[PDB]
Structure formats: structure tokens, C-alpha cells
Amino acid sequence: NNFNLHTPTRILFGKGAIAGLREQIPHDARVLITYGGGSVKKTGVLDQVLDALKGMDVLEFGGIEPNPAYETLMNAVKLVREQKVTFLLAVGGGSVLDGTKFIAAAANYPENIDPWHILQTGGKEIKSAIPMGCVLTLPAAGAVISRKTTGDKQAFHSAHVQPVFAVLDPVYTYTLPPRQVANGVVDAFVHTVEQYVTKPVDAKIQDRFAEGILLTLIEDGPKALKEPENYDVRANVMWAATQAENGLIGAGVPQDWATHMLGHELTAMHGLDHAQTLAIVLPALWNEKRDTKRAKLLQYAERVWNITEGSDDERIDAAIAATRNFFEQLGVPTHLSDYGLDGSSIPALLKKLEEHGMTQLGENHDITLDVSRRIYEAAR
Ligand SMILES: [Cl-]
Ligand SMILES: [Zn+2]
């Protein structure tokens, strides 16, 4: 079908790609470097950024938490306008990136009016933003900000809060703990199938590219765990994951996201890692939705898993089992019971879904609360 695709961020990719950073920022810029909990200090990544920019007018602002608080981001907005920062540089992961996107937009929001209507409008009304770039220590318009003061977390998208550039050096991913490496692989995999294992619309390029991402993650994802400092492996996983999060594969095709929406309630209620909730929900959801997803499940089985023999139901069953096994071999269990959850929380989960308006989920808008109930139950 029809689509509007825009991917303006310049990618600087590869070993030592930070060598390209300095030339992207005006020599006379006043740069604010933003970061999270301080691990980038310990790894030496922040020092590499500081060295790359040596001689330039550089300031620092850290402490951006996972689920960046509206509190802290406003403090940065304060420093920015007070010190007349002209460029923002996010160093870290998606949390640092997202919070920095908000700072960039909030800063050119008018003087007096409150920046929270960025979130109320999903960034629809952003006309301009402080230029920003990033140095990503793992793959990441699109930012989810929390007020935490009573537990908010809304999203916003704007063609202006998109980074002008992103430095992606696979070497910076070598230090990620196995838990984070596996979670990243699962999350990339699921972001891809949220946009591919849906309904056939004869979007051949989108299908091939999605298939390509999945095949790459299955081949090199496990290797990233076994061989954490294998550059080629870590590079393929980083670049594949970037495409899984990026836009080409979703442009003009049906999108699901029900696995994400169901998974989100497991994180909110039980504190499970994002990717753990996806590994649990996806295979249960696929079995439940095997009717509407039938054609793309069979295409997935053939194109990604080389499953060609047997009935349609046998092929789909084998594809679901192969996917489950892939997640488990990455060290990411796929049943609620693996995490000590017996399913007694499902009534509370369904109440939260209803509270959050998640009552018509999926590409067919047909995953109602009774369907979500069956999916959680099957995931036990
Ligand atoms: Cl210079
Ligand atoms: Zn995700």
C-alpha cells in the first residue's frame, strides 16, 4: 500500500567510526553531551567522545535514567537555555537518546508554555529542535518519556528531533553483558516480525528485507554471545538490529504490535525485561492468531527456517517451535512459569490492558480482552 518514509539520520558505522564525529558538529558549537547512569565513563566511551571533540566548547549532563524522567530532562532544558547550548550529543542507549530528543524539542518550545504538550500531541506540533547527534552503545523521531512522579510514559515522534547523525561502532557493544546482548537480539527479531508476520500484501522488497534481517539475527545472534569480541559478528548484529528498528521494512505493510502491547503489561506489573516479555508472548500469540497470520507464517517458515515439507499446520507448528527454541537457546525463556509466574496475575493484567485502552489489538484490530486472556493463558 501507500506510505510516507523518511530516514534523515546520517549513519557513521564501523570500528573507530567516532573518527567521523567531530566534522559533523560546527567548530564553534556549544555542545552538551548527555548520558545515563555512568557506565560510558567506566568503559572509556565517554573519554573517546571527549577526545574526539577536544578543543571544542563541551559541557556534560548525565543521570538520564532508564525511563527518562520529565523531572531531569527539564533540568537539562534549563542548563541548555541558560548556557546557550547549540548542539546536543547523546552518548548511550535508547533511553539517553529518547530523553535527549525531548530536550532538543522542549528547548525551542516557546519560553513560557509548558513542554508537556510535546507528549500530549505526540510531537505533532514540533516546528524546530536543537540539532542533536548520538553515539550509540547499543542499537536504538521516537522517544518515550516518563514523568515518574505518578508513573507516566508517553511517546512522541518528530522529523525535527531526529538526530542529524548516529555513530554506530560495534566495538562499543563488546562490553554488553550476555543478558543485554540476548535481549537485544530478541527485541530486534520481534520488532521485525511485528511488521512481517502479518498479512500478505505482495510487498516483495519489504518481505525480502525483513526475511534478510531475521536470517542474519538467527545466524550471527547466537555467535554474538559465544564470540563477544568477534567484530564481524557484532557488526552484523548491530546493523541488522538497526534495520529492525528503522523504517524501510514497515513502510507500506500491515503492522501488528500486539506482542509488544501484551508484553508491556508483564514488564509494568512483574518487572520482566522488555525482551523477556516478547519471548513469552510471541509464540503464544502466533498460535492463537494462526488463522489470520496463516500465509505469512508459512512464508516465514519457508523463507527464514527452510521449512518446506509437511502440512500447513505442521509447517506453522515447526516454525513456532523453531522460534521458541531460538529464544531459549539465547538464554531467554518463553513461558511465564520460567519466571516464577503461575498465571494468577492474568486477571490483573487484563484490567491493565483495558485501563490502557489496549482492547482491539493486532493488525486486524481483533485481539480483544478475551483473546488476550487466551494468549496469556497459553503462555503460562
Ligand atoms: Cl575543530
Ligand atoms: Zn521492543
UniProtKB/Swiss-Prot annotation:
The record's comment on protein family reads: Belongs to the iron-containing alcohol dehydrogenase family.
Species lineage:
Bacteria, Pseudomonadati, Pseudomonadota, Gammaproteobacteria, Enterobacterales
Record has Oxidoreductase as a keyword: yes
What does the UniProt entry report for the null mutant? The deletion mutant shows increased sensitivity to reactive oxygen-generating compounds such as paraquat, potassium tellurite, chromate and hydrogen peroxide. The mutant shows increased level of lipid peroxidation products. Deletion of the gene leads to accumulation of isobutyraldehyde and a strong decrease in isobutanol production, suggesting that YqhD contributes significantly to the isobutyraldehyde reductase activity in E.coli. The mutant shows greater sensitivity to glyoxal but no difference in methylglyoxal sensitivity.
Its subunit composition reads:
Homodimer. The crystals contain two dimers in the asymmetric unit.
Q: Which function does this protein serve?
A: Exhibits NADPH-dependent reductase activity for a broad range of short-chain aldehydes. Shows highest catalytic efficiency toward butanal, propanal and the highly toxic aldehydes acrolein and malondialdehyde (MDA), which are produced mainly during lipid peroxidation. Mediates resistance to reactive oxygen species (ROS) elicitors, such as paraquat and potassium tellurite, probably by protecting the cell against the toxic effects of reactive aldehydes derived from membrane lipid peroxidation.
Its Gene Ontology cellular component terms are:
cytosol
Coiled coil regions in record: none
* Positions contributing to NADP(+) binding: 37, 39, 67, 94-95, 98, 137, 142, 153, 172, 175
Q: What class of enzyme is it?
A: oxidoreductase
A Gene Ontology biological process noted in the UniProt record is:
response to reactive oxygen species
Which sites bind Zn(2+)?
187, 191, 260, 274
Catalytic activity annotated for this protein?
Answer: a primary alcohol + NADP(+) = an aldehyde + NADPH + H(+); butan-1-ol + NADP(+) = butanal + NADPH + H(+); 1-propanol + NADP(+) = propanal + NADPH + H(+); allyl alcohol + NADP(+) = acrolein + NADPH + H(+)
UniProt xrefs under SUPFAM superfamilies = Dehydroquinate synthase-like
So which cofactors does this thing need? Zn(2+)
Q: How is it used?
A: Is able to produce valuable biorenewable fuels and chemicals from a broad range of starting materials.
EC number(s) on file: 1.1.1.2
Name of the protein this chain belongs to: NADPH-dependent aldehyde reductase YqhD
One example of the protein's molecular function in GO is: methylglyoxal reductase (NADPH) (acetol producing) activity
Pfam families found in the cross-reference section: ADH_Fe_C (PF25137), Fe-ADH (PF00465)
| Comment, domains | Molecular dynamics simulations of the YqhD homodimer show that the oxidation state of the NADP/NADPH cofactor has a profound effect on enzyme structure and dynamics, which is consistent with differences in enzyme efficacy toward alcohols versus aldehydes. The NADP-bound YqhD fluctuates between open and closed conformations, while it was observed that NADPH-bound YqhD had slower opening/closing dynamics of the cofactor-binding cleft.
- CDD domains per record: BDH
